[PDB]
Every structure is written in C-alpha cells, then in structure tokens.
Amino acid sequence: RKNKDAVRRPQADPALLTPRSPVVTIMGHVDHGKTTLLDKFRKTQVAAVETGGITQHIGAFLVSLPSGEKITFLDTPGHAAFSAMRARGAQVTDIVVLVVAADDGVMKQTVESIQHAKDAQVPIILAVNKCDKAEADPEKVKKELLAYDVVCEDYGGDVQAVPVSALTGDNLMALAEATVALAEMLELKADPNGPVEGTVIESFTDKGRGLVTTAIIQRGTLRKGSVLVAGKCWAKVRLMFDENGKTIDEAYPSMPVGITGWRDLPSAGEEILEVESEPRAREVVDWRKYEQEQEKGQEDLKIIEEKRKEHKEAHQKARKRERDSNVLSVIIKGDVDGSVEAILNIIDTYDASHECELELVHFGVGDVSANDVNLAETFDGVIYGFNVNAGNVIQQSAAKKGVKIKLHKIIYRLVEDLQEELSSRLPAKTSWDPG
C-alpha cells in the first residue's frame, strides 16, 4: 500500500511568514486564581459561575488588550487529574503564565506545570497571585522556584516575575505589558495562506451541531468548505464559531475556533491538517486507520503466536462463566474527550486489582444512551456520567433493567463515588487511592 497520508507542511519560508498573535497558557495549582486572573483580563466573571469552583476544561479565549493587541489565553484545569489537558496546553502554548499563590507557594501541580513548560520549551512568566493576603511572600516563592529552575530576573533569571492580586485586579496591567513584551521578543509569525494547520483543544458532541471540536489554528486561514483531517477523523468545515458562538468568516493563526462538521470525533490535542477534497481526505483517513490496524495486528500476532505455541506444545506431547462479586464493571461518559481521557487515566492508575477488579466496559462522549444502558445491563455494571444528562426515558429504562446511572459534575466527587462502589464490592474501605 502506497503512503497516502497527509503530512504537516514543511516550515514556511521567511517571505511567507507573517506576524501572528501569541498563545498564552495559564497554568498553576488548584485554586491559585488562574481562572480569576483570566476573568480579570477578559472583563467577564465566570469563576462564580462554576460547578464546585473548579476549572475542569481547557478553555480558549481570544482576549483583546487595551493596547489593541490580541492574545489567546488557554485556561487549563489545575487539579491533579487533568495531567493530559495540562500537557496538551503546554504543547500548544507559545508562552506559559505560571500562577503561584503567594500564600501557598510552589505546589505539586505548579512543579508539574513547570516541567511541562520545560518539555514544550516555552518561556515562562511567573504571576505571583494572592499578594494582598498576609504572609504573601513573592521573594519566598522565587527562592523556592530556584529549586525547580524557574530563576527570576532579580536572581539573574530570564523568567519575569510579576506580583499581582487577581481578586483586586492590581498590577494586571504590568502583567499584560510583560506578556506583550515577551511576545514581541519571541517574534511569533506564521504563514496566513495555504493548507491549514491546527491543534484540537477539545472535542464534544452537541445535539444541534454534531461533532464539534475546539481547535487553535497554527498556519493558514480556515474557511467554510475547507476539508480537514485530524487523526482518524475528517470534516468539511460547516460552521466556525467563537467562544460566544458568533459565526466567524475566517480563522487566522493563533485564533481559537470551534469547528463543526466532523464525520468522526477526533481526540484532544491531535493535529488538524487541511487537504484538497473529500475523496483525498477519506483516502488519508483510510490510510491512517490501516496503519493503526497494522500496529494492532502486529501486537495481536505476538499474542496469538504465544497462544498457538502453547497449544502446539500441549498437543505434540499427547502424540459463559458467572462474574465474581469483586469485579466492578463501569461505563464512562464524558461531556468532552478531555474529561473522558482524564477519567480513564484515573482508572488506569488502579492498583487494587487483587481485592476488586475494575473493568472498563465502554467509554464515550455524550449523554447516557440506550446502548450504554444495554452494556450496563449486560455486564451488571454502573454508568458514571461526567457533566452529562440522563433523560427521563433513559432513567426509566435503567430502572427497569437494574442498571445504576450516577451523574456527577465534579471529578473528585465522581472519584469518591467510584471508591465508594469499590469498597462496597469489597468483602471495609478500598486500598486504591487516586491522589
């Protein structure tokens, strides 16, 4: 089979290059004011309007500074669970604003964000927040960051440290000035023409718009009718929209745009590349699926050869089961692929296999559906929904079929419920811990 894949275009020529707005990802530790800082910059108050006051979604916003420049802020979840989301944000970011609470100093997720920033090789700007409250010690914060290699200017370190108070909106002007200065120094540019290149930041299924993916353009302009391919999925761009939902004619580099029309839902963080036409896009998708199938086939050949050698050794020499009580079968349903992946990572961290197995019957994005209920009935399982809805008909059917649907709106609440179920299945409290 000839290689028909679609490959990211080679680096554009300096003549083609053109100035582009910067992408800044706000990363930090739980409840250290990332979303509050973002709210201050956006002039909108969303921190109050949240479920559990926790950012559980890597959200993009195209803020316009008073100077007239434009910055794409990616506000990332701060909880320990969303490591994949934080890593993807670090990957797509041009600059990383590490928000550290002066009161609490460095933390585990702060170190994780610094490590991701180093891995992505992205300049880091420190925002020491909560400076108003007593014991606020930006000097201590800088001294401790010295350990993790984030050296401030005062100590002859390239990283710029800015004391701010997102609650009181003080010094944010200087933070924005520093962001603009760092963007200028980086001199970010990209080709605004040719086939589009972008990255998927989120994916979900909307009952009115179909398979919708929030992406960030990286090269070229996206327009209605362009044929996109990302991972194993492809789209004919049907509707581009913004954070507000206003249809936008074009998507210039470093703009966050929600794209509709995906024939299949791509995975978060995958690369979107434009192709010539629908037949070419389908060819690319088929080739990629075939490559994945070949990899899986090699692995399956290894396993099957193990089994067949066992059987041959056995033979040449001569010449349904009831599921145990200690097996929790779970369906996972998420509002976005990011949430689904976070829950799956939490599950994969499982280590209490001996006392009770945790089988993942099926996972998906969208409201708990009849097929999910059927899987749960078939495997005497439990459906866990993360910020998804369970219609009245589905509730009636689940009650009839004996399935348990447990919707949740907070990741740690869902994890507490899951550990509760594991303990219940135990013959006591479970020994597996999420962190």
Binding site: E293, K296, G297, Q298, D300, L301, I303, I304, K307, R308, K320, E359, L360, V361, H362, N374, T378, F379
Partner: protein, 68 residues
C-alpha cells in the same frame, strides 16, 4: 465439533443488538476477541458445530483480519 470431525472451534457469546444472546463462531486462524469488545456478526451456520449459526465478520470493529 460433532463427529467425525475433531477440533476446538473458537466461539464467543454475544448479546446481539436485538437483545438475544447467541454463540458466534470466530473464523480465521487465531484471533484476539476479549470480553467487552464489539463485533459484527453475519449469518451462515458453522456446519460442524450444533446450535451455532452466527459467524463473526473479520475486519470490522474489534475483530481484525487474520495475520499472515
């Protein structure tokens, strides 16, 4: 299989979409179907297996082709 044939034919138990449970034969030399996996099933009885009248279609969903 029933006499005079001798073999250990590979089969699985599936909850078909219609709500019935049935035994599906797994063609091809070797496979990997584990529990919880989705397969497509066609008709056509396996001649030497009594009571088995469904063949798992290769190359669809979770049942990859036979490996050369």
């Amino acid at each position: 299989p029933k006499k005079p044939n001798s073999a250990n034919r590979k089969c699985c138990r599936v909850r078909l979409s219609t709500g019935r449970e049935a035994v599906c034969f797994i063609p091809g030399e070797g496979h990997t179907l584990q529990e919880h996996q989705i397969v497509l099933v066609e008709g056509g009885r396996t001649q030497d297996l009594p009571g088995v009248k469904l063949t798992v279609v290769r190359g669809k969903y979770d049942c990859g082709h036979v490996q050369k």
